[PDB]
Each structure stands twice: as structure tokens, then as C-alpha cells.
Amino acid sequence: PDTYTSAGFLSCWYQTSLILPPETTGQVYLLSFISACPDFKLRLMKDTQTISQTVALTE
Amino acid sequence: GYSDRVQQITLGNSTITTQEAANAVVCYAEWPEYLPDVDASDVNKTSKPDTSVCRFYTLDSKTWTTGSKGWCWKLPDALKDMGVFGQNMFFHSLGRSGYTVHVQCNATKFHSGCLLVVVIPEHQLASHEGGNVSVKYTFTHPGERGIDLSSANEVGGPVKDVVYNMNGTLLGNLLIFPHQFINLRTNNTATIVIPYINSVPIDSMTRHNNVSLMVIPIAPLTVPTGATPSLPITVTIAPMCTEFSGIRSKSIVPQ
Amino acid sequence: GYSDRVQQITLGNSTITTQEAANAVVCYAEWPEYLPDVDASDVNKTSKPDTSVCRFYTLDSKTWTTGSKGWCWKLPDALKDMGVFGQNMFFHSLGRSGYTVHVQCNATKFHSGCLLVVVIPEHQLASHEGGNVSVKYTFTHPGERGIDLSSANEVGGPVKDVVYNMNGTLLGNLLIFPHQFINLRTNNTATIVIPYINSVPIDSMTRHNNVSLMVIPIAPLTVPTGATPSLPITVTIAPMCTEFSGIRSKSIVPQ
Amino acid sequence: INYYKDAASTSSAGQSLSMDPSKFTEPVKDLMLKGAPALN
Amino acid sequence: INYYKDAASTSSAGQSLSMDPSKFTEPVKDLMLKGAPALN
Amino acid sequence: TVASISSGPKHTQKVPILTANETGATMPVLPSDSIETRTTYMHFNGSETDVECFLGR
Amino acid sequence: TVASISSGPKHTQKVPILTANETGATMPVLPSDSIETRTTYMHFNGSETDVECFLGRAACVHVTEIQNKDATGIDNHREAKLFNDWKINLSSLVQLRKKLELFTYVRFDSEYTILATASQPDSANYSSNLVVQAMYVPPGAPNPKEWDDYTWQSASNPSVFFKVGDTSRFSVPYVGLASAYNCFYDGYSHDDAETQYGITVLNHMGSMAFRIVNEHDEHKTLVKIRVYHRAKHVEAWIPRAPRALPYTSIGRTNYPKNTEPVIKKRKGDIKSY
Amino acid sequence: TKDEVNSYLIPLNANRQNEQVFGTNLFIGDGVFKTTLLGEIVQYYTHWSGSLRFSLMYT
Ligand SMILES: Cc1cc(CCCOc2c(Cl)cc(C3=NCCO3)cc2Cl)on1
């Protein structure tokens, strides 16, 4: 994450509202996915902050 | 597998999808178009902001309850404050526009209720005082709030009696105007495309509204047992083919 | 009977006539043009308000007196509040523009004085504090008022020393930038056409100014005997080929 | 002969032999001819 | 120029420039057209 | 190669943005299916994401 | 090519030497417009003033230092120079800086040469042979905390291993975000009221990290790293006025207060020779 | 507060009007995005450019 280079925000709101049928109750859920369009470019490979270690593993 | 039923309208940087439409009406069978030269009078080149003004603005939501009488919005007023559409509006001497109106109201297969969605070209309102009392400016320029036909008479405001369309004609005959119904059992949206209708080629956007959009409950809302007794109605509207002309200082309007 | 001397520039709904010009400069010999697709990156269609933004805005006037050190305006900042140009500016995420700058100063055949009118692409100012003190935002966004090089150092503001161009270079070498002189004895206006110059195809109009226009007295004003010792200088600027893209909510900027 | 695959790895570029000072020395809108009067 | 006899000794391979995400993004048995309804 | 084509207003019966993810597919939706776009080119090949490159240092 | 043509007496109505500088042009006047000349040829091409040539020789851009010593009980390797870094930038040293700042935007590939020499300021039996490891931690990469971390594994990070006393060399493509490097930037990261100003906000391309692979011997060894940078494939736009005052900071234009007059005062009159 | 199947579920409430369902910035290399396959790969590179596809499936 970098400021100059930042991309925006994504929000979601009720346009009208969720309505449940009779005999039904509680919360309903949305699942959300993300994938890249065919548009996408990635460059200049580097090391990931997502994995590290303190001693070599063994068998 | 195309149904009359599912639709997508993309206009500018905004898109609407409905999975329960009932076709769409195009007023008087004409689609909005720009102002041709043969019809032009003002010699000024006009400004066509295109995608920055021709996108969808969603007005604040209303709440249909069993006591609702109906709501009324005027155009271009309702949009007087939306993004760059509104700025352009206050800043040019003249402007012209068509619109896509999308009214939304979803419920379930146990609800009943039916709204009339109608567009009335030149809807001159009546004073509830009678005689020749006028309807002051502010009252006919409610902005995004629109007029709530179940609100009380106010002074200098219009009459809000529904079976008379706010003008001395019967609710039953509003069907001669481009309109579409939202019947919970069928429909969940209404869409009307409005071409620019006037007796002059371009006009002032602030001293004259050229259509009122009206949403009126006709078959009362009836919710399933122990359901909450109300549904929200949302109105989203997009200017289309907008042109502004005679730029200058920026109008100052009452109130 | 055309002279280099008389000129007319009509842009939008506004026209300028000068009867005492000294040709006009077109930065780097290039005239403003829109953004070609081959150079485009953002996929958004852009908005080109045309004549409503590409007209001439006259900023408030300055007063050249014998003690004047020079003034500095930044673009697009100077126009941040002019008509619809400004609205568009705060409302889109990205925008791009070229300009016609016309600086005016008339006197009589008894006055003497000579101003340098120069456009500096990417004029990064220096803090008068030295070291690595930054120059706060507000200080580099004076708006139509511009920066007055004979005003006092302020805190968080830039240095205002003229023989160093506000950045560690000598006044004498500003002539490598597109510029024109106003020598009372010759000239009464200066006109420079600025093409859009950046390292990206389109940018933010609020976090980055892409040129500073600078008017600097170099040969001091000398009025005839018992004349009032001062002349007003007026700056009129017109955006040209403006395009805005990525419309939304409307930026909020410091101060 | 490039021994390497990428363009960044090649040696220095070779002389522009472009050279056109007029964008800097004569950016005037109406063309000035040497010998003709500067201001008409 | 390979200086060595065995194939393992050659340098890195060169870009597939193959690229076909459909085995991963659209492994459906009956073809789906964008724009047509998902479920008929 | 175009990264985005030019596309304008739409009012159709053909909605590319409504799908059924239950199917297991990721439908190839693009910016131009839901906003108005302008042409732009890719200027890029995806060279440095080739698996030979990824595992080759 | 002729450098001067032959030209003789003139008595004309066509005066090329009278102009109006107010126009902003520099009219192309030549010796032969105002004296009588003889033909002469140029014999010269202007080869060595090409911008590729001007920016194309190696310049020292950075000197750092690391030491090889027992890290036993060191709570902060970075702080013991058990390994250092250099948040990459070409504004540090001013010799190459002034040259670059003659332009506004610049685009080029870089060729780096890294010379490493060792020093043994206090009593050693010998000079050990150390191997340096220079790894470029791209921004958003695990920063080496220690001197034998997991980061030094650099399995995806380009790294080079060379011997002290020796030199390492390679080249890097133009890794700029934009179409060119901004030598100057009159803007901010975002519309804040306290956010920094300049390019120091634009030029955030991580840092380089050095370290000695070898464990520690009985004595201590100082290794001093010098990074040289050569631009190749240069492209430069928009010339600007040269730097007159001294520099104070990487990335800001700021000059020091109570600096000295930069124009030499005459010893004599305006009339003096 | 501990990783759970539940942080994949965006809840929806019946009968709310005008209100907001969720919000997030778009730093694809951090925050919600970071553990997704997209987020996870983006992290092997320094720069990205392109369009993203965000979809919501209703349950
Ligand atoms: C201006 C300017 C130019 C640069 C250079 C960018 C960083 O370039 C490097 C890269 Cl991509 C890799 C290495 C490197 N890889 C293995 C050893 O060093 C070093 C540098 Cl300086 O930064 N500001």
C-alpha cells in the first residue's frame, strides 16, 4: 500500500432493502469473490511478506 | 433466453440491472436526441458534458405504507443538486435534456399492491386555495425530496388531492400519459425513457420544469401476516443527451 | 496590413484583442491537443466540456510599483474556482488541460519598465527554512491570489527570493523556459500557449500543479514626472483542450 | 553481438544525431524571418 | 550457441506465450455465453 | 493488443454482469460490460509471470 | 559542412541584426551577418555533447559501510552495521545530481558497478576473504532484520555475490512507474495539509541491502561499499536553469540560509576589463 | 478475532433502508484482499495495473 499510488474504495448499500418471506427469519449472507480482468499486468518480482522462518526445517 | 423481464441499462459510469422488469416505455415512441440545427435559434455552440452528466443519480428513498397517497418529483428540479449535472444547470442560461427514469420496489410473492408510475409533460399544479391564488416557486421546486401528496396543505403550495392529479383532472385518466405499473405480483421496477418535450428548442432549467414524474399507490400495499407493514420505493434517474448553452455567472434562485 | 502587433484570440464565448503584441510563444513549439488512445491508460471515456471550460478567465489584478519583486501563480490552481472549469476539477478523479495565458500591462511612451513572463514546467519550490523542511500544501495552492514574492516568509511556505527562482537557480537563466518580455516601450501584452506537459497521460488536478506562470519586474517601473508611481498588471488565462475523467463524489482539499 | 537477452543489458545508445534547437530558440507562433523586421 | 552436449545444460527456456485460462476459469460441461442467462 | 475497447450506453435484454457462480465458472467480465470505456492498448505481454521466469532464479 | 560562408560588404534595407527579444525567440544570427567572412568548415559533429554521452559515464552515487564481527550479543544488527542498506536514490551525491537536474523528466536503464574494499584498522594477523551479498528489497518485501535471516534467502529477489576488493556489475531496466523519472515534482501524494512535498514522495523504489556472508574471524574487518551508476539509453525532456545554490536535502529544492553571493563581484567598475 | 468460516460471510438485515452493507479500501496487497489467491500472487510482484472483477453471490 502506497498513497500516491492508491486505488479508491468499494462500498455497498441497500438500494431498496432485503425482504424475507413469511415463516423465515434472521440474517442472510452474501459470499464475495475477487479475480483479475484479462487487462491485468503484474511486474518486477520480489519476495512475499507472507512467509518467513527462523530455523531450517528438517525431516 | 432474453426475457422482457431482465434488463441492463449502462449510462456513463453507472449500470442498473433488473431481473423483473415489464418492458420499458419510451414516451410518445421517441428516444432522446440532441438539438438539430434546423430547429436551433440561439447562435451559441452548446456544451455536451456527456458521461459526466449522463449517468444515473439515485434520489433518496421513500416509504410506502398503507396510508401513502403518492409522491411527485419535477425535472430537471429533482436533479438540481446532483454532481456536475446540477452545476451546469445553475451556470448556463439555457440547457435541454431527456432522461431514463427507473423506479424500484421489490416485495415477496405474498405481498400485493400496485403503483402507477407516470410522466406528465407540463404538469401545471393547482393552488388548494381556489380562485386565482398562485403556487409559489419554492413549492414547485421541492428538489430531490419531491412533493408528498399525503403531507398537509401549506400556504402558497399546491393542492395534494390524489384523485385530481393536483390539477382538476381524474386519477383514472393519467393513463393517457406515458406510464407503467409496478404490480408486486408481476413487476418490481418501471422504466420510462423521456425525450425532451417543449414548445421552444431549449429553455431555462430553473424557471420551468418540463415533466413531473409521479408514483401513486393505487391498489394499497398489503403485507403478509405479521410482516412489517411497509416497503421502500427508490427512484434513480439519468439525464441523457444533455446540452447546456449560454454560460455565465451562475443563477441565484429563491430560497 | 497584418502586424505581429495586433491580435485577436476567441476561445469559447470570450475574445481578447491586443493592438500591441510581440508575437506569441507556443511552449516547445507544440499546441495543446487531446489525449490520444495510443497514450491512454485509464479505461474511462473522458468528458470534454468544450466551450464551457475553454474560455478566458481574468484573475484579479496586481499592482506593479517600484518596490515589486514579482508574482507567481500555479496551474491548474489559479483556476480552481473559475466557473464550470473549477467544478469539473473538484468532481473528477483525473483531468488534463493546456492553456492560453495573456498577461496585460499598458503605460505610455514616457514610462519605462520591463516584466519577464515565463512558464516553468514542474516548478518545485524550496522551503526558506533550508534543510529538508517541506512547503505545506496551502502554501503552494494560493488560488487566484497567486504568491507575492515581496510578501514575508511564512511558516511552511516557500522562500520568496527572486534572484533564485524560488528553487536554487538564478533569475538570469529562466530564459531557457518558454517566456516573453513586456517592455513598456515595445509591448503591452505577453501571450504563451501551453501544451499539457507531464510524465503520465492524465493526472490529479488537485495534488499536482504542472506549471507556474511567473511575472517578474526586471527593469524597474519608472513613471514620467509626477505620474502616479504604479501600473496594474492583469492576467487572463483560458483552459484549452480540457478533458476530465473518473467522475465521482467531489474532492475535499486542505484549508 | 548482444550476449544477453534483455534490452537493458546492451551498451550505450549511439548519437541522436537529431539536433533541432528551434523548439527552444524559436517557439514563436508566427514565424520570424531573419532580416525582415521583428515587429511589423 | 550451446557449448555443451546435454540438454539440461542449456539456459532457461523462453516464454510459453501459451496462456489459456479456460481450463481453470470455465471448466463447465455445457458452454456458457456471456450475456445469455446463466441458468435457463 | 487492445486492453479496453470503446463502448457506449447500453439498454439491453442481454446482461453480461448477472451470472450464477454456483456453476464453478469465472465468467470473463470486463470494464466495458458495465461502464462506457475508450480504447486503450496493453503495451505488455506478461513475460515475467511465465512459470519459467517465476521458478527460474 | 560549412562553419562560415564567404560574405562581403552589405548596404541593405534588410538588417538581420536588429530584433525584438521581447518575443521570446533567439534569432539565429551568424558572424556573416555583420562582418565580411571567408569560408571555413566545421570538421566536428557534436558527438560528445549528446545527452547519451553526457549522462552515460559511471558516477559514484553512494558510499556505505558494513563490518564482519561477532554478532554474539548484538541486539540490533542493523545498528552494528552487521549489515546496512541504502534507501536507493540518486540525489545523495550532488556531482551527478546537478547534471541530471538540467532536465525535468529523464528515462534510462541503469548499469550499477559496486566496488567493495576492506580495512582492518586494528591489529589483525591477516586480511580475510569476505564475500558480499547485495540484495534489492523491492518495496513491500520482507526487510532483513538480522544478518542471516530468511530474507537473505532472496528466492525471488535479485541478488549478487562478489568478493571484497572485487567489483560486481549488472544493469537494471528503467523501473519507473510513469513514462519517465520526475527530476522535479510540484505536487503531493494526496490532498493533505501536512503531507510532504516534492519527489521524495514519488521516488519510493525500496532500498538495497548489503552484508558479508562470511562468519566472523578473530579480528574485525570494515568493508566500505561504493555504488557507481551509469545511465544507458537516455531520453531527457524539458531543459531547466542549472543549479546555482548548494543542496541541503535529497529530493527538495531547498538551499541553505545565509548562503553566499553566487555571482562573482567585479574587482573594479562595470567598465573594468 | 480468530480465523473463522464466518469472515467469508457478509450479513444482510431484513427491512433496513438507505444503510451501508460493507466498505473496504482497495489495497489489493493488504487487508481483506491479502489472503485471497489474487492478493497472494500480487505480493510476488512490485507493481500491478489493470481491472479487478468483484462479484457477490446471494444465498
Ligand atoms: C532514479 C532512480 C533509479 C533507480 C534504480 C532502481 C533500483 O534498481 C535496482 C534494482 Cl531493480 C536491482 C538491484 C540489484 N539486484 C541485484 C543486486 O542489485 C539494484 C538496484 Cl539499484 O532508483 N532511482
Side-chain angles (χ1 to χ4, degrees):
Chain A
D2 150 85
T3 294
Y4 163 98
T5 241
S6 98
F9 302 98
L10 168 64
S11 62
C12 168
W13 314 77
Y14 294 100
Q15 170 82 165
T16 55
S17 119
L18 156 75
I19 298 236
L20 293 176
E23 295 317 324
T24 259
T25 203
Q27 269 174 343
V28 312
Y29 302 109
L30 307 174
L31 252 35
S32 79
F33 318 71
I34 189 116
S35 48
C37 293
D39 205 296
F40 222 72
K41 359 222 141 76
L42 244 25
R43 43 174 225 199
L44 213 166
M45 181 175 169
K46 55 104 141 144
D47 267 313
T48 185
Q49 263 149 154
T50 72
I51 236 224
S52 81
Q53 112 190 86
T54 81
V55 301
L57 303 173
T58 70
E59 227 156 84
Chain B
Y2 299 16
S3 167
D4 251 8
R5 291 271 214 33
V6 176
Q7 299 219 115
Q8 162 168 159
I9 308 164
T10 301
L11 200 45
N13 100 97
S14 70
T15 282
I16 278 177
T17 64
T18 181
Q19 242 163 126
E20 253 182 279
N23 207 136
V25 155
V26 176
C27 297
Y28 302 115
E30 277 193 41
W31 199 285
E33 80 191 1
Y34 298 79
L35 167 58
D37 296 346
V38 64
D39 275 2
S41 180
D42 148 52
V43 296
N44 276 294
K45 152 117 135 242
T46 68
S47 166
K48 310 198 183 35
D50 197 34
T51 41
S52 286
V53 305
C54 293
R55 54 180 314 288
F56 272 117
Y57 304 103
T58 300
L59 269 32
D60 211 45
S61 268
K62 272 45 258 268
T63 294
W64 178 18
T65 88
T66 211
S68 287
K69 302 271 110 227
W71 311 255
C72 167
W73 295 263
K74 252 105 176 61
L75 289 177
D77 190 47
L79 305 180
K80 90 316 226 312
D81 263 291
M82 305 283 188
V84 179
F85 172 88
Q87 286 306 298
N88 271 297
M89 189 172 141
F90 282 98
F91 274 107
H92 300 73
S93 202
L94 292 164
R96 146 201 230 278
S97 184
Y99 304 98
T100 283
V101 167
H102 182 60
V103 179
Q104 312 140 247
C105 177
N106 58 282
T108 82
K109 328 185 109 54
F110 304 78
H111 291 70
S112 355
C114 173
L115 300 173
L116 165 75
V117 171
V118 55
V119 163
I120 308 172
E122 300 287 347
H123 201 206
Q124 193 193 141
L125 292 189
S127 187
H128 59 313
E129 223 129 303
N132 64 322
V133 180
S134 125
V135 173
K136 340 261 275 212
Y137 194 97
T138 351
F139 297 107
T140 66
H141 300 76
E144 141 199 358
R145 234 196 82 120
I147 302 179
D148 174 340
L149 245 60
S150 72
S151 86
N153 278 346
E154 32 193 331
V155 167
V159 42
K160 303 144 124 121
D161 227 322
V162 218
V163 153
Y164 304 136
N165 305 321
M166 305 180 82
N167 61 196
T169 64
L170 271 181
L171 167 74
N173 292 340
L174 229 44
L175 266 51
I176 186 71
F177 296 106
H179 68 275
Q180 142 141 330
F181 284 95
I182 295 189
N183 182 197
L184 301 182
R185 58 141 30 235
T186 296
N187 228 2
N188 97 200
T189 55
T191 300
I192 302 179
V193 184
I194 310 164
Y196 176 68
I197 301 161
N198 201 177
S199 49
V200 301
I202 216 195
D203 206 357
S204 143
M205 280 165 109
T206 59
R207 84 205 175 171
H208 176 210
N209 291 122
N210 10 244
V211 285
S212 55
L213 163 64
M214 216 152 147
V215 171
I216 295 170
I218 297 223
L221 166 71
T222 292
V223 323
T225 265
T228 298
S230 80
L231 245 36
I233 288 167
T234 299
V235 164
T236 296
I237 305 184
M240 93 200 234
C241 290
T242 311
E243 254 156 313
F244 299 107
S245 148
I247 209 206
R248 87 276 122 160
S249 328
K250 172 120 149 164
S251 304
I252 265 166
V253 298
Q255 178 270 241
Chain C
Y2 299 16
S3 167
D4 251 8
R5 291 271 214 33
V6 176
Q7 299 219 115
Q8 162 168 159
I9 308 164
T10 301
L11 200 45
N13 100 97
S14 70
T15 282
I16 278 177
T17 64
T18 181
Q19 242 163 126
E20 253 182 279
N23 207 136
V25 155
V26 176
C27 297
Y28 302 115
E30 277 193 41
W31 199 285
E33 80 191 1
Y34 298 79
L35 167 58
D37 296 346
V38 64
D39 275 2
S41 180
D42 148 52
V43 296
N44 276 294
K45 152 117 135 242
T46 68
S47 166
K48 310 198 183 35
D50 197 34
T51 41
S52 286
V53 305
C54 293
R55 54 180 314 288
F56 272 117
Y57 304 103
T58 300
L59 269 32
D60 211 45
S61 268
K62 272 45 258 268
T63 294
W64 178 18
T65 88
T66 211
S68 287
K69 302 271 110 227
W71 311 255
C72 167
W73 295 263
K74 252 105 176 61
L75 289 177
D77 190 47
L79 305 180
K80 90 316 226 312
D81 263 291
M82 305 283 188
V84 179
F85 172 88
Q87 286 306 298
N88 271 297
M89 189 172 141
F90 282 98
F91 274 107
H92 300 73
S93 202
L94 292 164
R96 146 201 230 278
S97 184
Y99 304 98
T100 283
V101 167
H102 182 60
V103 179
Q104 312 140 247
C105 177
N106 58 282
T108 82
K109 328 185 109 54
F110 304 78
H111 291 70
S112 355
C114 173
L115 300 173
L116 165 75
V117 171
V118 55
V119 163
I120 308 172
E122 300 287 347
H123 201 206
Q124 193 193 141
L125 292 189
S127 187
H128 59 314
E129 223 129 303
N132 64 322
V133 180
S134 125
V135 173
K136 340 261 275 212
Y137 194 97
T138 351
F139 297 107
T140 66
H141 300 76
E144 141 199 358
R145 234 196 82 120
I147 302 179
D148 174 340
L149 245 60
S150 72
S151 86
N153 278 346
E154 32 193 331
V155 167
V159 42
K160 303 145 124 121
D161 227 322
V162 218
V163 153
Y164 304 136
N165 305 321
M166 305 180 82
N167 61 196
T169 64
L170 271 181
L171 167 73
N173 292 340
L174 229 44
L175 266 51
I176 186 71
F177 296 106
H179 68 275
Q180 142 141 330
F181 284 95
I182 295 189
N183 182 197
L184 301 182
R185 58 141 30 235
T186 296
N187 228 2
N188 97 200
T189 55
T191 300
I192 302 179
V193 184
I194 310 164
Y196 176 68
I197 301 161
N198 201 177
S199 49
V200 301
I202 216 195
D203 206 357
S204 143
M205 280 165 109
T206 59
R207 84 205 175 171
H208 176 210
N209 291 122
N210 10 244
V211 285
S212 55
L213 163 64
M214 216 152 147
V215 171
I216 295 170
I218 297 223
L221 166 71
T222 292
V223 322
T225 265
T228 298
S230 80
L231 245 36
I233 288 167
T234 299
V235 164
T236 296
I237 305 184
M240 93 200 234
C241 290
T242 311
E243 254 156 313
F244 299 107
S245 148
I247 209 206
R248 87 276 122 160
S249 328
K250 172 120 149 164
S251 304
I252 265 166
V253 298
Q255 178 270 241
Chain D
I1 264 115
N2 294 152
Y3 303 113
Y4 301 111
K5 215 197 249 231
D6 293 274
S9 88
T10 54
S11 39
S12 240
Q15 143 189 213
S16 199
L17 171 116
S18 261
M19 279 249 230
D20 174 50
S22 9
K23 8 151 139 83
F24 313 117
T25 71
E26 267 155 278
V28 299
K29 168 158 164 315
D30 321 291
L31 167 103
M32 273 179 2
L33 247 33
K34 187 227 283 183
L39 316 139
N40 29 11
Chain E
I1 264 115
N2 294 152
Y3 303 113
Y4 301 111
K5 215 197 249 231
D6 293 274
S9 88
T10 54
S11 39
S12 240
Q15 143 189 213
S16 199
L17 171 116
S18 261
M19 279 249 230
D20 174 50
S22 9
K23 8 151 139 83
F24 313 117
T25 71
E26 267 155 278
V28 299
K29 168 158 164 315
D30 321 291
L31 167 103
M32 273 179 2
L33 247 33
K34 187 227 283 183
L39 316 139
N40 29 11
Chain F
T1 298
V2 328
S4 81
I5 73 211
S6 221
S7 142
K10 221 160 279 203
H11 182 152
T12 7
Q13 203 108 119
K14 219 182 120 215
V15 170
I17 66 169
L18 278 176
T19 182
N21 270 16
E22 355 326 74
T23 65
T26 310
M27 219 82 275
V29 169
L30 310 181
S32 52
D33 285 316
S34 60
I35 67 169
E36 292 202 42
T37 44
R38 71 160 293 150
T39 307
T40 55
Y41 300 114
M42 277 260 145
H43 303 295
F44 184 84
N45 299 137
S47 265
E48 166 185 35
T49 37
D50 196 281
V51 311
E52 175 97 9
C53 184
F54 184 68
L55 300 179
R57 32 190 64 189
Chain G
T1 298
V2 328
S4 81
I5 73 211
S6 221
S7 142
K10 221 160 279 203
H11 182 152
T12 7
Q13 203 108 119
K14 219 182 120 215
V15 170
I17 66 169
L18 278 176
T19 182
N21 270 16
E22 355 326 74
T23 65
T26 310
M27 219 82 275
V29 169
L30 310 181
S32 52
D33 285 316
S34 60
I35 67 169
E36 292 202 42
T37 44
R38 71 160 293 150
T39 307
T40 55
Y41 300 114
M42 277 260 145
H43 303 295
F44 184 84
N45 299 137
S47 265
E48 166 185 35
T49 37
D50 196 281
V51 311
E52 175 97 9
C53 184
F54 184 67
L55 300 179
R57 32 190 64 189
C60 183
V61 295
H62 185 61
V63 180
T64 196
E65 124 185 78
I66 60 181
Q67 35 207 279
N68 183 25
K69 55 200 178 134
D70 181 354
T72 279
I74 315 348
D75 276 24
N76 174 198
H77 292 196
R78 162 64 166 298
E79 244 189 47
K81 335 286 215 133
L82 264 202
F83 86 99
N84 233 160
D85 55 35
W86 151 55
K87 170 136 176 20
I88 317 239
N89 90 74
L90 261 79
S91 266
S92 211
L93 281 2
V94 331
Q95 272 220 328
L96 164 67
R97 195 181 161 157
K98 173 163 225 223
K99 271 220 270 175
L100 274 165
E101 292 198 353
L102 226 33
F103 312 111
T104 300
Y105 309 114
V106 102
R107 187 199 173 103
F108 52 68
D109 296 315
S110 302
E111 173 201 75
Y112 282 109
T113 305
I114 305 192
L115 163 62
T117 42
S119 190
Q120 242 140 170
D122 15 67
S123 212
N125 277 341
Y126 65 73
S127 200
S128 8
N129 10 268
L130 307 184
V131 174
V132 178
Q133 148 150 35
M135 138 150 106
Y136 167 74
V137 213
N143 266 109
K145 247 119 221 346
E146 263 152 88
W147 80 273
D148 207 4
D149 258 31
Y150 67 84
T151 47
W152 298 106
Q153 271 185 39
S154 123
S156 268
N157 268 24
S159 293
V160 43
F161 299 79
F162 65 109
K163 290 201 203 100
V164 175
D166 281 359
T167 212
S168 136
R169 158 102 101 236
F170 59 90
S171 86
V172 358
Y174 154 71
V175 356
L177 276 191
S179 291
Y181 296 137
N182 268 250
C183 277
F184 303 92
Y185 175 66
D186 168 27
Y188 306 89
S189 55
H190 68 322
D191 299 294
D192 203 68
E194 291 284 329
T195 194
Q196 287 279 325
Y197 172 68
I199 119 199
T200 110
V201 41
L202 219 69
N203 278 20
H204 140 52
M205 10 223 43
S207 65
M208 183 129 49
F210 317 88
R211 91 163 169 149
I212 296 209
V213 183
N214 303 68
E215 296 280 306
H216 68 92
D217 308 300
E218 182 184 36
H219 48 272
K220 194 193 56 158
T221 298
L222 269 53
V223 168
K224 172 142 317 227
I225 286 174
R226 279 170 229 259
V227 175
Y228 297 83
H229 169 281
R230 193 172 91 86
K232 40 186 231 218
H233 317 145
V234 175
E235 218 156 350
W237 298 264
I238 319 268
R240 17 188 53 213
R243 207 178 166 84
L245 314 181
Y247 289 109
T248 73
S249 186
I250 269 148
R252 23 275 253 223
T253 67
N254 321 330
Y255 53 101
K257 331 206 239 204
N258 342 113
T259 209
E260 276 194 305
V262 38
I263 306 179
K264 257 182 214 254
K265 180 175 167 131
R266 284 229 192 197
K267 176 211 148 108
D269 251 337
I270 209 180
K271 289 110 85 100
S272 275
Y273 294 112
Chain H
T1 224
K2 100 233 233 242
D3 311 309
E4 302 177 339
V5 171
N6 225 266
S7 57
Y8 284 123
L9 315 162
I10 306 192
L12 230 45
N13 286 312
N15 297 113
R16 314 260 174 105
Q17 204 164 293
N18 267 129
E19 197 175 298
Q20 167 176 27
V21 171
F22 69 76
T24 177
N25 63 245
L26 286 158
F27 280 124
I28 70 183
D30 200 52
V32 265
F33 299 115
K34 204 178 159 83
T35 16
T36 62
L37 180 55
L38 168 83
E40 203 58 83
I41 276 156
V42 142
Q43 299 190 55
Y44 279 103
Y45 291 85
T46 309
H47 306 152
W48 67 279
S49 164
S51 307
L52 304 159
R53 97 149 72 61
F54 178 88
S55 357
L56 250 33
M57 174 198 243
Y58 173 89
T59 81

